[PDB]
């Protein structure tokens, strides 16, 4: 065998660990890096200790633990000395779940048991104490969790029981207790655990793990609306699931299965969840057995640091504190100089429902994020293009009419695009010109490089003259020439003439429409990149008649494109202007091809330049994602900045507050002239947290 436990919990700052195994004992650890320091063992219990949990560090150093002896204990550290400070045993059966309510509710503890009851106990040495109790379930209550704070009326907590149900309660003033508010009959066996979502978005989230191997997530918009049920996945898991813990930020769902493995989960625009970064006797038998408890007991609760704790054997206490799998990867992010010069491009202003800062004016262009990259890494291509499509071109010297300033902008942006399609198609065509013993074909290829010059020059050296003159009628979209092309070709048909294949094609580039003509060019799908086909209808197509946007679109209607191409998808946006937002959701629903950071910078830079239409709801969605990514990577600085771009004030407050309270000593003067102050972060917020941690490091030192 080897060290095996049941539960564990980190505190507000994650410098103190706790473990409770079937050895009827607890173990308090001082965590400092990849090491694990043991301080003292706890001998109090008479049975297998199930779970533990810390209380907010504004009430001191306290720990609660429950066991098979149906007795919840409350431990506290006084100048180092550990001692049982109180006791709460009012259950005839075994206790299961213990969790401290949000600090706004004072020193309040929740307790569930197998006797089918749930109790809420108030501890105050000076203040008065008034316990509560409720008959929650039929066969017992496996667990219960506190809901995020929001008037003591808005206090709700979810419960799970071995009767297969998930009940929700609410603190009623009249009844002097927590009355039933909702029942949710979506399981078919023992509910092992239920956790409420610390997230702050308009929708609430609940996660119920079952013994029948299922997992339901319940959502709710309205405050009195119907709890929408939704299976995590339509097929049932391998083994029996136990725990369900949410991340403090990002609305991540860590899930602990019976296959000894932990499986992460995140949500999409759809609501359907796609998996995130994967990571990983004597009288005692009966005890375990009456608990329908298997030998494969894994667990995973998130920590204040939005980190994931999980049982292993790799550690002096079989509790790994791995950092989240930051799928997002960008080199320039880890730089402090990027954050600094990025703030300046902004004008920060506090909202009308709270002092919490939020972006009012932004001059962020794609160009910006190009200096911090290489002109080689695949990204620079994806980016620089967006920087030529959606970036508001500017013309130095103003002009008489507003239409003239327009057609010039219409033109300069047009040339940038095509002068880029060259840079990329470059090697593709250049190497297809070596493989050619047809000097004329060497022309049609040189025309895919938008180089009429070296194209016509070649036409003459080809010993044939006329075409060389017609090549010079290319860039311009003269109507009478697009007309003649179609007429010259129609008089090829009747003649039964046999024109050199690649000479009739050059003729097809004059008809302003090569991919739909009589002598069509759709055939070229075979050897030429889809991009290159596009480059044609962009240079020799009807530049003047249509709009640069529309045109690019009228090429897609001719071909499907790489269903999974970053650069290819970008265009599809540029394509449909009026429905650009409708198609963005249509995109991410089908392909994870646009970076998490990109989706934000994309929809955000477009909403502060007046380029397209954007729903606040959507903007926030991709702003949440990016704000968490950086945070998991421990760059709370840049994490904070992005959170600013949040449109729901009630949300920002929670996201910002919590992020700052936990990580203050890392958000100080030592980093770029008080980053938190340069963001217009509330004065009271800083002071509330600054002295909060000071209260902690006192008891610790």
């Amino acid at each position: 065998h080897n060290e095996l436990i049941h539960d564990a919990v980190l505190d507000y700052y994650g410098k103190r660990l706790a473990t409770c195994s079937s050895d009827k004992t607890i173990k308090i650890f001082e965590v400092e890096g990849e090491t694990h320091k043991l301080i003292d063992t706890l001998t109090g219990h008479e049975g297998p200790v199930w779970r533990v949990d810390w209380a907010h560090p504004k009430f001191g150093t306290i720990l609660a633990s429950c066991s098979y002896d149906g007795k919840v204990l409350i431990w506290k550290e006084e100048n180092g000395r550990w001692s049982q400070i109180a006791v709460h045993a009012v259950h005839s059966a075994s206790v299961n779940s213990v969790q401290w309510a949000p600090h706004e509710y004072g020193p309040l503890l929740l307790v569930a048991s197998s006797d089918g009851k749930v109790s809420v106990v108030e501890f105050k040495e000076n203040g008065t104490t008034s316990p509560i109790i409720i008959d929650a379930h039929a066969i017992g209550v496996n667990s219960a969790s506190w809901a995020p704070a929001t008037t003591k009326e808005s206090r709700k907590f979810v419960t799970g029981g071995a009767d297969n149900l998930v009940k929700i309660w609410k603190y009623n003033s009249d009844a002097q207790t927590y009355v039933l508010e909702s029942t949710l009959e979506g399981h078919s066996d023992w509910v092992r655990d239920v956790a409420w979502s610390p997230t702050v978005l308009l929708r609430s989230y609940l996660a119920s793990v079952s013994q029948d191997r299922t997992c339901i997530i319940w959502t709710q918009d309205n405050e009195q609306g119907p709890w929408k049920k939704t299976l995590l996945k339509e097929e049932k898991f391998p083994d029996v699931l136990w725990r369900a813990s949410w991340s403090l930020s990002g609305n991540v769902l860590a899930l602990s299965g019976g296959d000894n493995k932990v499986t992460l989960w995140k949500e999409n625009l759809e609501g359907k969840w796609e998996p995130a970064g994967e990571v990983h006797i004597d009288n005692a038998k009966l005890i375990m057995k009456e608990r329908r408890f298997t030998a494969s007991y894994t667990f995973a609760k998130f920590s204040t640091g939005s980190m994931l704790l999980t049982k292993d054997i790799v550690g002096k206490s079989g509790v790994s504190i791995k950092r989240l799998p930051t799928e997002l990867q960008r080199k320039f992010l880890f730089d402090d100089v990027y954050l600094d010069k990025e703030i300046e491009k902004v004008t920060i202003e506090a909202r009308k429902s709270n002092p919490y800062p939020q972006i009012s004016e932004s001059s962020l262009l794609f160009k910006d994020a190009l200096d911090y990259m290489e002109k080689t890494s695949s990204d620079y291509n994806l980016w620089k293009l967006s920087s030529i499509l959606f970036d508001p071109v500017s013309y130095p010297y103003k002009t008489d009419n507003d239409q003239v300033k327009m057609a010039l902008l219409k033109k300069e942006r047009h040339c940038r695009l095509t002068s880029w399609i060259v840079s990329q198609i470059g090697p593709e065509i250049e190497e297809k010109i070596r493989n050619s013993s047809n000097e004329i074909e060497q022309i049609f290829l040189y025309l895919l490089l938008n180089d009429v010059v070296r194209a016509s020059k070649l036409a003459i050296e080809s010993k044939n003259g006329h075409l060389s003159v017609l090549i010079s009628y290319l860039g311009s979209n003269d109507p009478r020439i697009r007309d003649l092309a179609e007429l010259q070709l129609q008089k090829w048909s009747t003649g039964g003439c046999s024109i050199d294949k690649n000479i009739s094609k050059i003729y097809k580039l004059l008809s302003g429409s090569p991919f739909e003509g009589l002598f069509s060019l759709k055939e070229l799908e075979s050897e030429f990149s889809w991009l290159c086909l596009l480059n044609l209808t962009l240079c020799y197509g009807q530049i003047d008649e249509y709009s640069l946007e529309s045109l690019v679109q009228s090429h897609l209607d001719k071909f499907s494109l790489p269903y999974d191409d970053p650069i290819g998808v970008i265009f599809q946006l540029y394509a449909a202007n009026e429905n650009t937002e409708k198609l963005y959701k249509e995109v991410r629903q089908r392909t994870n091809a646009l970076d998490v950071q990109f989706c934000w910078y994309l929809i955000q830079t477009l909403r502060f330049n007046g380029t397209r239409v954007f729903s606040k709801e959507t903007s926030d969605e991709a702003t949440f994602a990016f704000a968490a990514q950086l945070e998991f990577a421990q760059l709370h600085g840049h994490s904070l900045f992005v959170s600013c771009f949040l449109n729901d004030d009630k949300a920002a407050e929670d996201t910002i507050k919590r992020l700052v309270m936990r990580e203050i000593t890392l958000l100080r003067a030592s980093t770029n002239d008080h980053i938190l102050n340069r963001l217009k972060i509330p004065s009271q917020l800083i002071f509330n947290a600054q002295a909060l941690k000071d209260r902690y490091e006192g008891n610790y030192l």
Binding site: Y397, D400, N401, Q403, V404, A407, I440, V452, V453, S456, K457, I460, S462, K463, N464, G465, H466, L467, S468, V469, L470, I471, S472, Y473, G475, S476, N477, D478, P479, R480, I481, L484, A485, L487, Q488, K491, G495, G496, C497, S498, I499, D500, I503, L510, D544
Partner: protein, 379 residues
């Protein structure tokens, strides 16, 4: 007080004397009346070059259009250099004077397709690569064709020209002749929005020109066809094609000097022309008109001798006054003399009604005497 009110009635009769040849010419009267139709065409060049005097030139100055880089400054650089436009006025006058014949040829390359393995070749352009696989009849039906086009392009009937080069299914050809008529790009250019209504031109014509010239000097193809190309670029029409020269060697050798300054101009401004656009070399000939009428004088089979052609010569050089004063010298000498040709003295009264009228830039003595002697020696 336009003095041309009397002249207009000379020019009227001069032209109606051209019509007495058609009926029953065929004697000395068809020849002597080739002089009458020459007078009339002179009274016209006179009637319209004089007209060239101050005319609301101020508000003409277009200044909100420069910097445009529209490549279409012909409208301006033909309005600021009054000299070049003067040239042009002559050309249009010469154009309305070219002949225009008509002869019985459709379906392009007929007999060559039916018989020749030119089916692989198929197209004109792709042919020059094979030297001598043009069959007989075709190479001739195409010849008469470019004789009708060179003749008709000279006359500046460009419009009616493409309407025929299409009727013969020779559309590939027709296309090329659209770079010459447009020879630049008008689009969203403000001052011009009242004419075009749409984008109807071809950029890089300064680049395209040096192309069609590369076509004119390849020589593999028809003599006439090869000649019409050069016109549109420069004035080196194949000598085998320069047999004919009404005063067309005039009309062309001038187009030389004009579409050159034109080029060297839009070049000077860096406004319409890219550096890498110039493929084929082309010289900037300072072909001063006074020197061009002189090099053309060796191609004047005593065509620079005729009374009327000495006069069209001065009218072009604005040295019309010194001509009237160098002439009086003779009428004083009476010591043979061209002023005893029935035709020249009616043109001395030209110099009698204009000079005082336009600038009053002719002595009252040189005038007065040639009024007298004229009304004296009449028949």
């Amino acid at each position: 007080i336009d003095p041309f009110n009397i002249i207009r009635e000379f020019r009227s009769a001069a032209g109606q004397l051209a019509l007495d040849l058609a009926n029953s010419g065929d004697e000395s009267n068809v020849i002597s009346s080739k002089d009458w139709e020459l007078e009339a065409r002179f009274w016209h060049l006179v009637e319209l070059l004089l007209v060239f005097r101050n005319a609301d030139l101020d508000l003409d100055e277009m200044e909100l259009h420069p910097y445009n880089s529209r490549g279409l400054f012909e409208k301006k650089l033909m309005q600021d250099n009054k000299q070049l436009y003067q040239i042009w006025i002559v050309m249009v006058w010469l154009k309305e004077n070219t002949y225009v014949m008509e002869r019985p040829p459709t379906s392009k390359w007929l007999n060559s397709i039916t018989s020749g393995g030119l089916k692989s070749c198929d197209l004109d352009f792709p042919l020059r690569e094979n030297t001598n696989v043009l069959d007989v009849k075709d190479k001739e039906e195409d010849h008469i064709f470019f004789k009708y086009i060179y003749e008709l392009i000279l006359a500046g009937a460009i419009d009616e020209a493409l309407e025929e080069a299409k009727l013969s299914d020779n559309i590939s050809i027709c296309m090329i002749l659209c770079g010459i008529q447009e020879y630049l790009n008008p689009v969203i250019d403000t001052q011009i929005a009242n004419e075009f209504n749409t984008q109807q031109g071809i950029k890089k014509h300064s680049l395209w020109r040096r192309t069609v010239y590369s076509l004119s000097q390849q020589a593999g193809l028809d003599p006439y066809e090869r000649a019409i190309y050069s016109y549109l670029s420069g004035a080196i029409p194949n000598q085998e094609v320069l047999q004919y020269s009404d005063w067309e060697s005039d009309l062309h050798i001038h187009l030389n000097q004009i579409l050159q300054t034109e080029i060297e101009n839009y070049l000077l401004e860096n406004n319409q022309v890219g550096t890498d656009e110039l493929i084929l070399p082309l010289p900037s000939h300072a072909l001063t008109v006074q020197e061009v009428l002189n090099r053309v004088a060796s191609r004047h089979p005593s065509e620079s001798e005729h009374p009327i052609r000495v006069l069209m010569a001065s009218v072009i050089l604005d040295s019309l006054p010194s001509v009237i004063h160098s002439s009086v010298e003779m009428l004083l000498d009476v010591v043979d003399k061209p002023y005893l040709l029935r035709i020249v003295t009616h043109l001395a009264i030209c110099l009698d009604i204009i000079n005082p009228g336009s600038v009053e830039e002719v002595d009252k003595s040189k005038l007065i005497t040639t009024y007298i002697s004229l009304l004296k020696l009449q028949g």
